[PDB]
Amino acid sequence: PRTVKITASSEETSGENAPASFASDGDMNTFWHSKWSSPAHEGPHHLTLELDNVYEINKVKYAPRQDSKNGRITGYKVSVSLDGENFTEVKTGTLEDNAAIKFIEFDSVDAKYVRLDVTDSVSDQANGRGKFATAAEVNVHG
Ligand SMILES: CC(=O)N[C@@H]1[C@@H](O)[C@H](O[C@@H]2O[C@H](CO)[C@H](O)[C@H](O)[C@H]2O)[C@@H](CO)O[C@@H]1O
Ligand SMILES: [Ca+2]
């Protein structure tokens, strides 16, 4: 399944270069960051992959940002869509608070769009729970 594009609730291109599309390749040294520079978007955070076609998919891969825990996703909702407007929830859960590649698995389902809603996220800042969302890579498989 080829990712045509990634959209997000927001992205940072002013304080550093971290647009949503950085999460659509497997370079572990680049990432999407939610917008943190003023005016910041501090949630809710999400990310939508637009696949080039309808695919039967059953897995999402999440590579955390590798150089910092800011925005690391510890709670998520996965939804799928055929039209990019109406979404169906297929999976909810948590992910461990570390920089390891994560996999989210669910029953096979047709999708052209796959949306990752960030329900929980961590930070190295004391009051930073949920403020940030980052991803070195989000990808889908079938
Ligand atoms: C303990 C502490 O406050 N550390 C901070 C880092 O969080 C901070 O890292 C940046 O934080 C912003 C969001 O505020 C983005 O996530 C950015 O990508 C991070 O580099 C740095 C700021 O350089 O400063 C302290 O170390
Ligand atoms: Ca990347």
Swiss-Prot record:
Belongs to the glycosyl hydrolase 84 family. Binds carbohydrates. Capable of hydrolyzing the glycosidic link of O-GlcNAcylated proteins. Can bind and deglycosylate O-glycosylated peptides from mammals. Can use p-nitrophenyl-beta-GlcNAc and 4-methylumbelliferone-GlcNAc as substrates (in vitro). This is O-GlcNAcase NagJ. The gene is nagJ.
